[PDB]
Amino acid sequence: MSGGRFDFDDGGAYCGGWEGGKAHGHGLCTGPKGQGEYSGSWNFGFEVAGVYTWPSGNTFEGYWSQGKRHGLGIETKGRWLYKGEWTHGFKGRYGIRQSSSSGAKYEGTWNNGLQDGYGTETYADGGTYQGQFTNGMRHGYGVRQSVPVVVRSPLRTEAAPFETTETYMGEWKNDKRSGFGVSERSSGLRYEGEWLDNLRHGYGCTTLPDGHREEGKYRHNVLVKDTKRMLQLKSNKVRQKVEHSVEGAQRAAAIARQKAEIAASRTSHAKAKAEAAEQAALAANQESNIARTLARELAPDFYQPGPEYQKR
Numbered sequence: 001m002s003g004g005r006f007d008f009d010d011g012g013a014y015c016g017g018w019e020g021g022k023a024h025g026h027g028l029c030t031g032p033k034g035q036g037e038y039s040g041s042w043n044f045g046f047e048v049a050g051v052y053t054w055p056s057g058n059t060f061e062g063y064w065s066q067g068k069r070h071g072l073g074i075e076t077k078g079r080w081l082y083k084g085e086w087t088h089g090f091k092g093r094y095g096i097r098q099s100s101s102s103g104a105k106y107e108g109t110w111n112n113g114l115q116d117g118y119g120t121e122t123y124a125d126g127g128t129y130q131g132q133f134t135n136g137m138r139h140g141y142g143v144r145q146s147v148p149v150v151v152r153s154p155l156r157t158e159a160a161p162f163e164t165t166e167t168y169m170g171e172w173k174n175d176k177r178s179g180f181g182v183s184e185r186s187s188g189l190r191y192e193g194e195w196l197d198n199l200r201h202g203y204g205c206t207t208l209p210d211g212h213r214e215e216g217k218y219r220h221n222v223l224v225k226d227t228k229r230m231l232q233l234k235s236n237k238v239r240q241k242v243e244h245s246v247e248g249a250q251r252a253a254a255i256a257r258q259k260a261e262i263a264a265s266r267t268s269h270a271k272a273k274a275e276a277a278e279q280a281a282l283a284a285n286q287e288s289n290i291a292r293t294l295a296r297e298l299a300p301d302f303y304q305p306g307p308e309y310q311k312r
Contacts (some may be wrong), residue, residue: 062216072280180252203245
């Protein structure tokens with residue numbers, strides 16, 4: 001009549017409202033061999049708002065278009081969960097990806113399904129990055145707070161009466177400290193100057209907690225020039241080049257603080273869209289139940305595999 005069942009060639013069926021020869025209203029539709037199940041609203045052959053269940057028990061709950069996850073929705077997989085916006089099947093623009101295991105998390109913008117633009121990244125150990133992203137990596141300006149020796153033995157401190165975190169603000173290239181940047185440990189140990197692939201490389205100043213200033217040129221983290229002296233050229237004084245790089249590094253740090261603040265603002269937007277995505281998953285589940293009940297009322301022996309999936 002205006003609803004029922006249809007068996008596909010590759011296996012898997014459709015069972016629900018139809019009108020004008022196309023699925024319309026509500027219904028279920030399994031995949032080849034009856035594996036994988038959509039269940040929700042339809043409109044002229046295309047899912048509108050519904051829940052897809054993989055045989056693995058993984059699910060997308062949200063809105064659809066042209067057969068792609070589009071709009072808001074929640075994807076629950078084994079170890080990862082995404083809540084927020086989807087654009088033609090790709091995560092983004094705004095949304096959050098969270099670990100089922102750890103507190104590991106990304107909250108920000110996405111381009112082409114990868115972390116990109118501005119976002120807050122939290123690592124399993126509780127550290128964070130806030131700032132710019134490109135192609136799924138820390139890139140541009142940003143602020144990372146994390147846990148950071150040659151003598152392992154405590155002798156040097158066990159001898160006399162005796163009474164952490166590190167923050168890098170500066171340039172990032174493909175997930176690495178690279179360019180100008182400032183690095184500050186909670187002890188007071190600090191480096192301002194040039195970086196390459198997370199190492200001091202170029203000119204900069206290492207200042208010890210007591211304030212002793214080591215100024216010079218670093219090459220893959222090893223000092224190779226200092227400010228003592230001899231055949232130093234007037235045209236190329238280490239103190240000048242260090243000063244320039246230090247200034248370059250504080251500029252980069254302040255820039256990275258700004259991009260950090262933008263990232264924080266984009267993070268709130270991603271959170272807002274993640275909550276909006278919970279209401280989209282609630283609506284998707286309302287449509288799914290309408291389709292589950294109509295399906296039992298149009299074919300009481302037709303097996304719905306999604307329930308069994310999600311138990312496993």
